[PDB]
Amino acid sequence: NVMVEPHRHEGVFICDALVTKNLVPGESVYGEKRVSISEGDDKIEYRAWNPFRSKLAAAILGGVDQIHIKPGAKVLYLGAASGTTVSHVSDIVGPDGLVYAVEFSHRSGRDLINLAKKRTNIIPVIEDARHPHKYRMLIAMVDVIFADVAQPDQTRIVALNAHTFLRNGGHFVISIKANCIDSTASAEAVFASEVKKMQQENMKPQEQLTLEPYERDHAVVVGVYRPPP
């Protein structure tokens, strides 16, 4: 019998409970259940990925077609907060991948620094994502931008970082909480507005989905950056 099986998305696994292969066997990050499977000389530990705490997990269980975060990927994560979702991105991309974890708050910043001590593939960037000039000498060109900044001007911020850092034909994964962008617009009016802005900055949405039952009026938009010459 196979307990934990590869998910469709490479680097992800399903036990329906989503899990990622633990980069730091023995350690939990936010009190998540851990599941170690030993057979003979082999051994592999997984980490439970809670969809009520991670918008990315909620999107995966909601049936998103692509996440682009994959083994070996270079990921710029905007809005890294304390590292909950970032820790699972770190598992997915693996030792040959890279996760830049940008977060403004220095409180969450300290949780991120502790998380990165264990995970070599995390770079904490405790800076304001509005001003990429302050940190662009630290960021090699990335394959994916994941954004969860939760601001009304989130999309311009994300686009500013994509212009600087995202490779052509690179992808983005943007989490949009409607009442943080504009609590007096309907969720459909926010999502349509934000998707339009993306398209105007050559961030071409390829798919979108909401996150019920885990979150209300919360969308994830996945797409591709195809900038001009």
Residue numbers in the entry: 86 to 100, 105 to 318
What does the paper say about this structure?
Fibrillarin (FBL) is an essential and evolutionarily highly conserved S-adenosyl methionine (SAM) dependent methyltransferase. It is the catalytic component of a multiprotein complex that facilitates 2′-O-methylation of ribosomal RNAs (rRNAs), a modification essential for accurate and efficient protein synthesis in eukaryotic cells. Fibrillarin consists of an N-terminal glycine–arginine-rich domain (GAR), which is believed to be important for organisation of the nucleolus, and a C-terminal domain with a Rossmann fold that is characteristic of class I S-adenosylmethionine (SAM)-dependent methyltransferases. In the present study, we determined, to our knowledge, the first crystal structures of hFBL in ligand-free state, bound to the native cofactor SAM, and in complex with two fragments that can compete with SAM for binding to the cofactor site.
